[PDB]
């Protein structure tokens, strides 16, 4: 009979990547696509002023 | 002039509760209502033999 336990992906399609940035102080960033949980997002604090 | 950082919450409320219990063989359960922003989940190996 068997049964399945997990699975593992070998190959990753990556589309979209739409980005959001904010000011030095109007907090850290966010955008609608994180609630999707089918995406992956890493908020890294790197950019510059002016 | 001010700009918003976080919000938090001091008063929760929780909606419907689903279950999705797999037997000892096949292990992990799923519960499609997971994989959302709005549903919280924790696995708790449970009593259930025979």
């Amino acid at each position, epitope marked *: 009979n068997m049964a399945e336990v997990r699975s593992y992906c070998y190959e990753a399609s990556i589309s979209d990547m*739409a*980005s*959001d*940035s*904010r*000011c030095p102080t*109007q907090g850290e*960033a966010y*955008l609608d696509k994180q609630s999707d949980t089918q995406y992956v997002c890493k908020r890294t604090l790197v*950019d510059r002023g002016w | *002039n001010m*700009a*918003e950082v976080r919000s938090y919450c001091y008063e929760a409320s929780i909606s419907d509760m689903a279950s999705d219990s797999r037997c000892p063989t096949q292990g992990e359960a799923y519960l499609d209502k997971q994989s959302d922003t709005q549903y919280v989940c924790k696995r708790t190996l449970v009593d259930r033999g025979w």
Partner: antibody, heavy 127, light 109 residues
Framework: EVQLVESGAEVKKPGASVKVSCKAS????????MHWVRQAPGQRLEWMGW????????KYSQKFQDRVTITRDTSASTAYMELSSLRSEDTAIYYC?????????????????????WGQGTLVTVS | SALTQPASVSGSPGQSITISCTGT?????????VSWFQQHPGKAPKLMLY???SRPSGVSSRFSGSKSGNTASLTISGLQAEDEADYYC??????????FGGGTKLTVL
């Protein structure tokens, strides 16, 4: 000076596909740029653009995230916006404008100015 | 989205006008990105802003921009009368797309 012009007055049947050309003249199509800003008379300017002519990259307004596709070609120094599956609503004027890319050729954060020039305009009407 | 911009306005020549564009924190507030685009009806729009307070060189020094919170104010004085070009405010949002305000029909009486 800086010159952009495009296809003239044009009409398409509902469900057809428009192809508009932007022929950049009078400057260096180098640290390129272009955009597409739709306008018909009497409403809000929508920006459904794309932003990268060096690498051929693109970003679209979700509005039309998948409808328009864009071809960019330096031999003719020309960017071609093509809107597929147009509707009665879309009758409008499509301007192509530029906002200079940064030195690296990668366009992420614009110049502080955006549009220093504009296409000639192309009125597109749907039956 | 759709920058709030009021439909239309007017006044005596030389008199100050101010067209204020109200956005959200997503765009106008947390950025210096603004543009006011004089669009002559029948012709192609042009620039009349650049990073708020400053101006392209071919601008009538008449024009003045300003920002508070979520606002974009194009304040014109010393009117030459023939300067009603539908004014549209536009800015770069945080998500990486640009939005153009509802536009202000400018009324020269």
């Amino acid at each position: 000076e800086v010159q952009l012009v495009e296809s003239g007055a044009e009409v398409k049947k509902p469900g057809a596909s428009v192809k508009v050309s932007c022929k950049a003249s009078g400057y260096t199509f180098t640290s390129y740029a272009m955009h597409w800003v739709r306008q018909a008379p009497g409403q809000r300017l929508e920006w459904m653009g794309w932003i990268n002519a060096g690498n051929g990259n693109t970003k679209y307004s979700q509005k039309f995230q998948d409808r328009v596709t864009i071809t960019r070609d330096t031999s003719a120094s020309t960017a071609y916006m093509e809107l597929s599956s147009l509707r009665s609503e879309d009758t409008a004027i499509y301007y192509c404008a530029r906002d200079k890319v940064d030195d690296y050729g990668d366009y992420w954060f614009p110049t502080l100015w955006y549009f220093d020039y504009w296409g000639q305009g192309t009125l597109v009407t749907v039956s | 989205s759709a920058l709030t911009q009021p439909a239309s306005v007017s006044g005596s020549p030389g008199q100050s006008i101010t067209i204020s564009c109200t956005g959200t924190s997503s765009d106008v507030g947390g950025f210096n990105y603004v543009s006011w685009f004089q669009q002559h009806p029948g012709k192609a729009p042009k620039l009349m802003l650049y990073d708020v307070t400053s101006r392209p060189s071919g601008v009538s020094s008449r024009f003045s921009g300003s920002k508070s919170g979520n606002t974009a104010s194009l304040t014109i004085s010393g009117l030459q009368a023939e300067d009603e070009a539908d004014y549209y405010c536009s800015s770069h949002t945080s998500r990486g797309t640009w939005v153009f305000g509802g536009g202000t029909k400018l009324t020269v009486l």
